[PDB]
Design a protein around this ligand. Structure first.
Ligand code: MH0
Length: 183
């Protein structure tokens, strides 16, 4: 089942609350045609350059950041172009990236919430319509709807009473979430 870790700072928050709020701070890095010309809004893979167990990206509006974990692959200019696909196990959200390929891996200085054991696997054949692509490109572009939908489906798979409109606390009571110390 999905496993969620959250700082007790967000006790009382719903998952949807938090994601909407995080997305508001992160904004949109404008990773769009004609608007990616350097490393300021690409993010990066570990080990990379185009494949990794992690992909990480910091906001260009704030120091909000996320890390996607799993077995991940970006097609860049090969077909289907600009598609992230593969296995997505985790999404970790917070503030300020640290580390990298040459540091033992990426991490967040403040990791606020993470979602793991997502069990998502999108084949390259699905192109940008794959769930993995939609989830991560959504986050990059200021739209966490895809992530929210997937989390909601995973929670309801555990029990139909669970939701992204559940508080983190309720999800902990249900055995899916685990509180970590204040942020
Ligand atoms: C190797 C650097 C690099 C990384 C890392 C990178 C990471 C990501 N990308 Fe993405 N991306 C990179 C280099 C580009 C460029 C250079 C362009 C601009 C293409 C153009 O101007 O026609 C771009 N990406 C453009 C895109 C576009 C726009 C394509 C279009 O509308 O035609 C999407 C959807 C995209 N990416 C997805 C992603 C996703 C998802 C990730 C996360 C893995």
């Amino acid at each position: 089942s999905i496993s969620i870790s959250y700082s007790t700072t967000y006790s009382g928050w719903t998952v949807a609350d938090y994601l909407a709020d995080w997305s508001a701070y992160f904004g949109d890095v404008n990773h769009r045609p004609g608007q990616v010309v350097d490393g300021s809004n690409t993010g990066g893979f570990n080990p990379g350059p185009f494949d990794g167990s992690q992909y990480a990206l910091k906001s260009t509006a704030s120091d909000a950041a996320f890390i996607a974990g799993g077995d991940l692959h970006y097609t860049l200019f090969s077909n289907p172009s600009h598609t992230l696909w593969g296995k997505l196990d985790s999404i970790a959200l917070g503030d300020t990236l640290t580390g990298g390929a040459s540091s033992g891996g990426y991490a967040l200085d403040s990791q606020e919430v993470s979602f793991s054991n997502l069990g998502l696997d999108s084949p390259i054949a699905q192109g940008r319509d794959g769930t993995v692509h939609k989830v991560v490109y959504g986050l990059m572009s200021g739209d966490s709807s895809a992530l929210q939908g997937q989390i909601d489906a995973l929670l309801k798979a555990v029990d139909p009473s669970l939701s992204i409109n559940s508080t983190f606390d309720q999800l902990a009571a249900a055995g899916v979430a685990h509180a970590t110390p204040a942020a």
